[PDB]
Ligand binder design. Sequence first.
Ligand SMILES: Nc1ncnc2c1ncn2[C@@H]1O[C@H](COP(=O)(O)O)[C@@H](O)[C@H]1OP(=O)(O)O
Ligand SMILES: Nc1ncnc2c1ncn2[C@@H]1O[C@H](COP(=O)(O)O)[C@@H](O)[C@H]1OP(=O)(O)O
Ligand SMILES: O=C(O)CCC(=O)C(=O)O
Ligand SMILES: O=C(O)CCC(=O)C(=O)O
Ligand SMILES: [Ca+2]
Ligand SMILES: [Ca+2]
Lengths: 415, 415
Amino acid sequence: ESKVVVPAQGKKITLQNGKLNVPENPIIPYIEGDGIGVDVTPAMLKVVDAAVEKAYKGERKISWMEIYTGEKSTQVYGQDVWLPAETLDLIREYRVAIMGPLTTPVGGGIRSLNVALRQELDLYICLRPVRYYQGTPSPVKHPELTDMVIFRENSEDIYAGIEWKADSADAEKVIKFLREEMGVKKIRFPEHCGIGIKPCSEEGTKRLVRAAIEYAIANDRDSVTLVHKGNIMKFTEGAFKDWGYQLAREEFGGELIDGGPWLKVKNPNTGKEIVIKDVIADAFLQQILLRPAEYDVIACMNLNGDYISDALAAQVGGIGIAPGANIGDECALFEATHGTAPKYAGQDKVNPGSIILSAEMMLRHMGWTEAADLIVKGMEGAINAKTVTYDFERLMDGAKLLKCSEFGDAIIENM
Amino acid sequence: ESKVVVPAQGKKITLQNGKLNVPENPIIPYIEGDGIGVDVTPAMLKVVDAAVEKAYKGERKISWMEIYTGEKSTQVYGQDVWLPAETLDLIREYRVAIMGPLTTPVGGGIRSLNVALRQELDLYICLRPVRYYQGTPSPVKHPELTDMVIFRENSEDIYAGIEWKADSADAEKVIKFLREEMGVKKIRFPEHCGIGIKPCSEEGTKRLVRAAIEYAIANDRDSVTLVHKGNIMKFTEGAFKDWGYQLAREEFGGELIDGGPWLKVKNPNTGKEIVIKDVIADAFLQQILLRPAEYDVIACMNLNGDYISDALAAQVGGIGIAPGANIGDECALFEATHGTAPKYAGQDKVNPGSIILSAEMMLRHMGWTEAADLIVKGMEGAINAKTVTYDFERLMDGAKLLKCSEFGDAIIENM
Ligand SMILES: Nc1ncnc2c1ncn2[C@@H]1O[C@H](COP(=O)(O)O)[C@@H](O)[C@H]1OP(=O)(O)O
Ligand SMILES: Nc1ncnc2c1ncn2[C@@H]1O[C@H](COP(=O)(O)O)[C@@H](O)[C@H]1OP(=O)(O)O
Ligand SMILES: O=C(O)CCC(=O)C(=O)O
Ligand SMILES: O=C(O)CCC(=O)C(=O)O
Ligand SMILES: [Ca+2]
Ligand SMILES: [Ca+2]
């Protein structure tokens, strides 16, 4: 028995040959989110409606439709309903959706609801753009040199949750198989030993890298860097790097730069040379601090992407305003990237920036670039104005302290 | 037929009940290192001899004994000799050794010689202290707030090199076993798929965490933070966190702080309260930038430790001067932590700081704290004096440019 209400006014977005067809009255499912979701989601709804209204002078309007996942889903659908089947069906059916932060419970053997959503809908691209907003307090000297776009592989890697607990019958069984059937000698302590599996496939790697390159082409970016720990994990991380370079050669006319290993790919629209290169992951966490300007589009595996995105967000003072998308071939789910921060929930206190900027990515994904531009513009103005939420204000002098909802208004005020 | 020459003057260090017995004329094996090893090692030898000579007025002297691993080993012992058996025997026999950077060849199925050395000698602690040297050009505003000591688990994790290449008969076999015998459903693309294994054991985790806590006690440090990605990898990363906390409760009288989950451990020598806490790895890469002062001793798994150490080193401007040790129960191997940088090899140009500070850790490990203190003092003086190698100088105004060997002298000059 669904508790979802389809808006009476409103039409579903359609997908016609890899191309979204967005009506002027699209229905957008949204998940409020747990904890501070109660604060940031309404700020996002208001800010989005304003930008859309201003951009198209009332010709277009989103019909928001609440759907459920997480703690609130249990309150709505009952006890063990953390992720209702219909939520998966609805996101797929309506093609574009957005969500606040989710609470995954502990003690019940439930795995990350965020990851569940990504894997279940096969949203194989985790897209995390990272730029600096002038006026943001940052811990680094030159945050303005950071302008990157992370394509993080979302469907494979150790992140896929294949593992067995130490001393479990399964763990014992897997370890037996490995030592006796596979002749594995390098397990240091085979007893009381947990075991995880890290898969990385040619198809998985290539759909991710294909998207990263298409994005560099579509947006006239300077380069795509394959980031990997291939010198230690040759057949997963190293294979990802090799497949990445290969895809570039096979589908995009990638050709050797000097002695290699870097390649150049010609932008078929602008004729610009896009550099395809690679950096070992540990060095890369150094290079983003020391030479951020040399990096643009990044393509990498699941776990590394997680680390890199977070490291970048912190460096530009954007820990609380980092936008993110999960994109597959059939639908897309945009998200607040921070946690539920239950301590502040309901206080109208936290920064709605992250979910607002994810909504910006959503609008842009929908082809409503004018409205998306107004959000970027509003965000830039409000931050420049030093009219900000506590998390920014406490790090600045002469800022005006705004509530969550008030920061929403300040964004609108600057549109 | 050994090509190693045991020094005529000199005595071997001994181990008596977990306690090193160091004679006044200890023999120390050293591996020159490939590439810039030719530049930094002699700078290290000279700087160490000076500190030892000054500290003990000639009463003590190290008898350096060259041993081999890497490219130079092939030149010495022949074609496929990258890591001679005797090198393992010698390091174990002489208890304390140091090395420059190593070249692991590509194309021959040889795995990291660094990792080989660590695993083969069971040097299960990778010890990476990270502090700021006043005067070092850093990309962050307040590098002086960083004063941490990383205990990185060295013997397990995905870093152990257990994996099979996509399309290999073994890969196919492992994937078959997993899908059909283990009922694994979450491998997205089972074809053309590489597979790695990530082990984490109770014993492996606890010997690492035990060392981290003993170190916090011995050095009156404020806290030990377990860093892990346990919310996604429950049975490896999560188990490491749980075992860590458990070890603290079982062996060190760890007790709940407030509602937990943090614990307090009483320093049995100073009565100081040592906090045992934990942070998810992705957040931790943010927290080291945003709140570096809240962190002290870190305990974490192999791969995470790799990332964290490198990220920290970059933030304090120490990418080229980061010291490191590999420590086991029977011996210890100190190392330059940077690469071989072949482009500058032999130019007497690069920064010998990393290997010099690893030598500082070696001297301290040997109980020769007075000599170790003189190196710290020299390094602080030379850097403060702005008398530095190109890698520092190019980032500063009004520095004096020194060659590698000259920077060695500047350190001595400041002792
Ligand atoms: N949008 C936001 N605006 C301001 N602070 C945030 C935001 N999101 C997260 N935080 C901070 O990060 C944490 C994220 O919550 P959690 O990781 O427990 O789910 C919160 O405790 C809060 O930390 P703080 O106590 O420093 O203000
Ligand atoms: N001790 C050092 N002093 C100065 N620069 C170093 C040092 N170690 C490494 N580097 C730099 O880091 C790289 C490490 O070498 P590799 O990772 O290829 O093995 C070198 O190319 C050099 O980069 P750079 O060209 O910026 O001067
Ligand atoms: O999603 C989770 O629940 C943990 C991993 C994470 O933060 C992410 O994947 O972005
Ligand atoms: O050791 C290697 O060869 C690569 C990994 C690394 O740099 C390290 O483990 O410190
Ligand atoms: Ca994250
Ligand atoms: Ca490293």
